[PDB]
Amino acid sequence: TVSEANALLKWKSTFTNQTSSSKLSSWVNPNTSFCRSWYGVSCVRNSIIRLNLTNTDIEGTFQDFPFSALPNLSYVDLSMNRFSGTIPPQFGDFSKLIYFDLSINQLVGEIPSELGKLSNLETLHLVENKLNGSIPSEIGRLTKLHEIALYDNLLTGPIPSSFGNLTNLANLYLFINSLSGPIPPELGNLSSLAELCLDRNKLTGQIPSSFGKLKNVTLLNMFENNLTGEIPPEIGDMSALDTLSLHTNNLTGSIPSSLGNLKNLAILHLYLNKLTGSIPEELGDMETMIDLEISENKLTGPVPGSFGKLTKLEWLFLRDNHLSGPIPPGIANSSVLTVLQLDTNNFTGVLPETICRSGKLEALTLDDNLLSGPIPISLTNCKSLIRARFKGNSFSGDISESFGEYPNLNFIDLSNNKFRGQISPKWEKSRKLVAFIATDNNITGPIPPEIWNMTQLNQLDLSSNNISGELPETISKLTRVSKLQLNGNQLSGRIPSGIRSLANLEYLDLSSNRFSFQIPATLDSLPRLYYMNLSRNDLDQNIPMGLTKLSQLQTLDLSHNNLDGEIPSQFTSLQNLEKLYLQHNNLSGPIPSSFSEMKSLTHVDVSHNNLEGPIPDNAAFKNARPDALEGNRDLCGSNTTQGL
Numbered sequence: 001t002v003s004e005a006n007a008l009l010k011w012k013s014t015f016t017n018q019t020s021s022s023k024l025s026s027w028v029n030p031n032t033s034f035c036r037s038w039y040g041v042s043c044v045r046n047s048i049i050r051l052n053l054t055n056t057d058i059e060g061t062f063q064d065f066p067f068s069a070l071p072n073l074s075y076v077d078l079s080m081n082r083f084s085g086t087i088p089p090q091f092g093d094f095s096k097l098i099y100f101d102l103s104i105n106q107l108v109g110e111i112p113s114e115l116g117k118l119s120n121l122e123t124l125h126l127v128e129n130k131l132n133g134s135i136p137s138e139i140g141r142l143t144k145l146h147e148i149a150l151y152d153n154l155l156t157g158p159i160p161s162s163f164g165n166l167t168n169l170a171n172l173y174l175f176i177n178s179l180s181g182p183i184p185p186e187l188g189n190l191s192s193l194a195e196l197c198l199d200r201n202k203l204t205g206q207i208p209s210s211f212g213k214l215k216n217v218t219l220l221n222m223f224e225n226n227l228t229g230e231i232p233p234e235i236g237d238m239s240a241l242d243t244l245s246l247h248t249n250n251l252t253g254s255i256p257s258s259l260g261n262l263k264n265l266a267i268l269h270l271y272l273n274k275l276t277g278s279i280p281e282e283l284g285d286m287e288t289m290i291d292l293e294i295s296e297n298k299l300t301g302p303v304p305g306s307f308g309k310l311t312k313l314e315w316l317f318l319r320d321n322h323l324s325g326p327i328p329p330g331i332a333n334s335s336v337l338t339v340l341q342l343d344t345n346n347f348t349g350v351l352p353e354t355i356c357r358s359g360k361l362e363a364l365t366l367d368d369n370l371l372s373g374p375i376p377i378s379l380t381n382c383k384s385l386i387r388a389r390f391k392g393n394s395f396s397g398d399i400s401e402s403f404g405e406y407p408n409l410n411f412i413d414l415s416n417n418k419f420r421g422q423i424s425p426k427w428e429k430s431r432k433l434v435a436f437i438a439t440d441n442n443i444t445g446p447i448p449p450e451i452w453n454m455t456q457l458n459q460l461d462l463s464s465n466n467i468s469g470e471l472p473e474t475i476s477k478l479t480r481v482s483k484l485q486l487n488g489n490q491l492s493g494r495i496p497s498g499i500r501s502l503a504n505l506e507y508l509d510l511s512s513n514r515f516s517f518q519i520p521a522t523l524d525s526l527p528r529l530y531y532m533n534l535s536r537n538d539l540d541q542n543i544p545m546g547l548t549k550l551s552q553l554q555t556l557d558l559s560h561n562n563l564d565g566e567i568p569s570q571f572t573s574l575q576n577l578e579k580l581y582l583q584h585n586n587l588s589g590p591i592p593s594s595f596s597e598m599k600s601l602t603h604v605d606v607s608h609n610n611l612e613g614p615i616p617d618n619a620a621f622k623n624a625r626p627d628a629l630e631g632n633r634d635l636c637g638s639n640t641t642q643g644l
């Protein structure tokens with residue numbers, strides 16, 4: 001005691017970067033008050049049994065720790081400090097030790113195999129250190145152990161097979177490590193095991209079939225390993241499982257139908273594997289299933305209609321598989337299903353009428369399938385919708401009658417379909433909507449003026465449709481639009497000067513349209529614009545000087561128009577211009593020879609114009625092909641088609 005108090009003081013005398021305010025100030029008067037007023041210290045019959053110095057800013061090492069002087073120690077918590085160095089083998093000499101915690105420290109080196117001498121240990125905690133090497137096999141001797149936590153370390157080698165002998169172990173936490181080799185099948189002997197967390201390691205081999213005897217395990221985390229083979233059907237015998245996470249592995253083969261037997265399983269993560277074959281119909285017998293994610297695999301065949309039996313399903317992640325056949329109505333029938341992602345599959349047929357029958361669905365993805373037919377009515381009136389993606393399908397129908405008002409809509413993508421009809425003004429009710437993309441449809445009619453009132457819109461893409469009419473000056477109301485694509489339509493009249501107001505605009509494409517008359521001269525107020533495709537239009541007259549005030553312009557394509565006159569000398573203030581396509585115009589006269597000052601011009605086409613004179617000094621003109629520079633009236637000082 002009085003010896004113990006001196007020993008601990010001699011240890012405390014080695015701590016560095018200590019403060020007068022340290023909680024260890026109370027380590028005073030060893031002769032009288034060791035067992036009554038010292039912080040961390042606690043005694044029985046006047047001998048220290050409990051040292052709890054957690055989070056006391058102690059900086060130091062365990063070298064001069066008085067192992068021999070504190071024999072009756074049975075509770076050591078030195079966690080959340082700045083301890084460094086190694087774990088001396090004398091820690092195994094605390095024959096009475098029950099709880100041992102050195103976590104959240106800066107300890108280095110291996111784990112002394114002398115820890116297996118601590119026969120009375122019930123909890124071992126060494127997490128969040130830089131301990132390396134392999135886990136001592138003698139730790140399998142501590143058969144009173146209830147919980148082993150070695151996570152967030154640099155441990156390597158395999159999990160000791162001796163750990164099968166830890167018949168009282170309930171929790172094994174080995175994640176964030178570099179453990180390797182196969183999972184020892186003796187882990188199946190852990191009848192008392194509750195949580196097994198081996199995730200985020202470099203484990204390999206197959207999942208031991210003896211895991212089926214782990215009848216008390218409720219959490220099995222083995223994700224982000226390099227496990228191989230197939231999911232053994234004996235995993236279906238782990239009846240107490242509620243969370244099974246095997247994702248980001250290299251597993252193969254089929255999904256065992258025995259997984260249906262897991263009546264308490266609420267989370268199943270199998271994604272990012274190489275699983276093949278059909279999804280068994282027994283996976284619908286997972287009555288507790290909340291979050292099923294088997295996306296990003298090689299699964300084939302149809303989704304079992306038995307998925308209507310998953311009445312607690314909330315998240316279904318089937319994306320990036322080779323699933324096929326029609327989508328069964330059971331797959332969306334859940335009253336609580338809020339995320340149904342099916343994109344990047346080979347689904348055929350039409351959408352089931354059950355899609356949003358309960359009005360709780362929020363995320364729906366169907367990108368890159370072989371679907372067709374109309375939008376089901378329950379989806380038309382699915383006011384809860386937040387994210388919708390229909391890209392790359394053959395959906396048909398009146399785009400005005402197919403889509404009701406979505407107040408909660410945030411992102412919808414109708415690209416690459418066969419939608420007909422006119423854009424309804426109902427989309428204005430989606431006041432939180434920020435991106436509207438409907439490329440490559442058969443949409444016709446005018447853009448309703450309500451669309452410009454949608455100020456929250458960040459991205460608007462109506463390209464490759466058959467939309468007509470003249471753009472109103474109220475287009476200036478799109479304050480926050482930054483990607484604007486109306487190209488590939490039959491919009492007509494002049495270009496509205498209101499595009500001057502879209503200051504956030506970055507990428508603007510109005511090409512392949514029927515815009516005619518002069519480009520608005522005022523258009524000098526787009527400081528974020530790095531792209532302007534006005535090509536393949538009917539625009540005629542001088543290239544306005546306002547375009548030369550668009551500093552950040554990287555690409556500028558005014559090709560296939562009726563522009564005339566000379567290329568202005570004020571292009572030089574577009575120092576950041578890289579690609580510039582002015583071909584197939586009626587431009588006249590020479591370049592001012594200030595194009596040498598401009599540098600980043602690499603791809604320039606000035607073909608089929610009435611210009612004359614010599615090409616200026618920059619790469620693109622030297623690197624131009626015959627087609628790039630052909631067609632002009634008097635090309636080059638020495639009538640050249642290629643270099644000088």
Ligand SMILES: *[C@@H]1O[C@H](CO[C@@H]2O[C@@H](C)[C@@H](O)[C@@H](O)[C@@H]2O)[C@@H](O[C@@H]2O[C@H](CO)[C@@H](O[C@@H]3O[C@H](CO)[C@@H](O)[C@H](O)[C@@H]3O)[C@H](O)[C@H]2NC(C)=O)[C@H](O)[C@H]1NC(C)=O
Pocket residue numbers: 108109110130132133
């Ligand atoms: C387990 O880790 C220890 C400690 O390694 C140290 O801590 C890690 C968290 C990393 O930051 C390492 O970069 C860091 O070194 C390893 O022992 C260490 O071995 C190296 C040599 O491999 C030692 O460096 C040498 O130190 C001597 C002593 O002055 C010099 O003469 C040499 O020139 C050289 O600098 C290092 O001191 C040593 N650290 C110790 C013993 O605490 C150990 O090898 C490793 N085991 C593995 C990876 O299996």
Ligand SMILES: *[C@@H]1O[C@H](CO)[C@@H](O[C@@H]2O[C@H](CO)[C@@H](O[C@@H]3O[C@H](CO)[C@@H](O)[C@H](O)[C@@H]3O)[C@H](O)[C@H]2NC(C)=O)[C@H](O)[C@H]1NC(C)=O
Pocket residue numbers: 050051052054075076077099
């Ligand atoms: C040293 O003393 C500290 C403080 O008493 C001990 O930390 C305690 O550790 C337990 C471990 O579970 C914490 O229990 C948890 O408490 C929360 C509510 O705080 C509860 O909701 C959880 O279910 C859980 O039981 C406890 O909070 C925590 N106390 C503090 C103040 O952080 C530490 O365990 C002691 N170590 C030794 C060896 O005596």
Ligand SMILES: *[C@@H]1O[C@H](CO)[C@@H](O[C@@H]2O[C@H](CO)[C@@H](O[C@@H]3O[C@H](CO)[C@@H](O)[C@H](O)[C@@H]3O)[C@H](O)[C@H]2NC(C)=O)[C@H](O)[C@H]1NC(C)=O
Pocket residue numbers: 487488511512533535536555557559579581
């Ligand atoms: C601005 O938009 C226009 C179209 O609205 C883009 O111009 C043209 O796009 C077509 C795409 O099919 C190109 O046609 C094809 O070109 C290849 C080239 O090898 C040719 O082999 C095919 O037979 C076909 O003609 C066309 O070249 C292209 N024209 C230009 C001038 O690019 C244009 O690309 C868009 N602007 C930018 C900067 O991309």
Ligand SMILES: *[C@@H]1O[C@H](CO[C@@H]2O[C@@H](C)[C@@H](O)[C@@H](O)[C@@H]2O)[C@@H](O[C@@H]2O[C@H](CO)[C@@H](O)[C@H](O)[C@H]2NC(C)=O)[C@H](O)[C@H]1NC(C)=O
Pocket residue numbers: 562564565586
């Ligand atoms: C291609 O352009 C030439 C150039 O004419 C321009 O006309 C003005 C717009 C102004 O920019 C002038 O500096 C240019 O000369 C067209 O040739 C003109 O055609 C008109 C007939 O409408 C005639 O009155 C002019 O005298 C012509 N100019 C010259 C120099 O001959 C030409 O018609 C244009 N071709 C196409 C297909 O658009």
Ligand SMILES: *[C@@H]1O[C@H](CO)[C@@H](O[C@@H]2O[C@H](CO)[C@@H](O)[C@H](O)[C@H]2NC(C)=O)[C@H](O)[C@H]1NC(C)=O
Pocket residue numbers: 044045046047071072
């Ligand atoms: C603290 O440890 C000491 C030994 O380091 C224990 O002292 C022994 O106690 C037993 C029975 O109480 C005696 O037979 C021995 O002769 C004692 N040895 C010494 C060197 O004193 C002491 O009992 C322990 N106390 C607690 C509370 O565990």
Ligand SMILES: *[C@@H]1O[C@H](CO)[C@@H](O[C@@H]2O[C@H](CO)[C@@H](O)[C@H](O)[C@H]2NC(C)=O)[C@H](O)[C@H]1NC(C)=O
Pocket residue numbers: 226249250
């Ligand atoms: C296990 O699967 C992973 C997939 O995440 C593989 O990691 C990829 O390997 C290839 C190169 O061989 C590339 O696609 C990437 O460089 C890797 N990382 C990815 C895709 O994130 C890993 O090689 C597989 N292990 C095997 C087959 O033993």
Ligand SMILES: *[C@@H]1O[C@H](CO)[C@@H](O)[C@H](O)[C@H]1NC(C)=O
Pocket residue numbers: 016017
């Ligand atoms: C004490 O803290 C300072 C500041 O972080 C650090 O530079 C130093 O290495 C620490 N240790 C000693 C012995 O000064």
Ligand SMILES: *[C@@H]1O[C@H](CO)[C@@H](O)[C@H](O)[C@H]1NC(C)=O
Pocket residue numbers: 161162163165
């Ligand atoms: C587990 O304990 C038994 C008991 O005798 C022993 O024979 C066996 O070798 C132990 N396992 C390992 C891997 O050492």
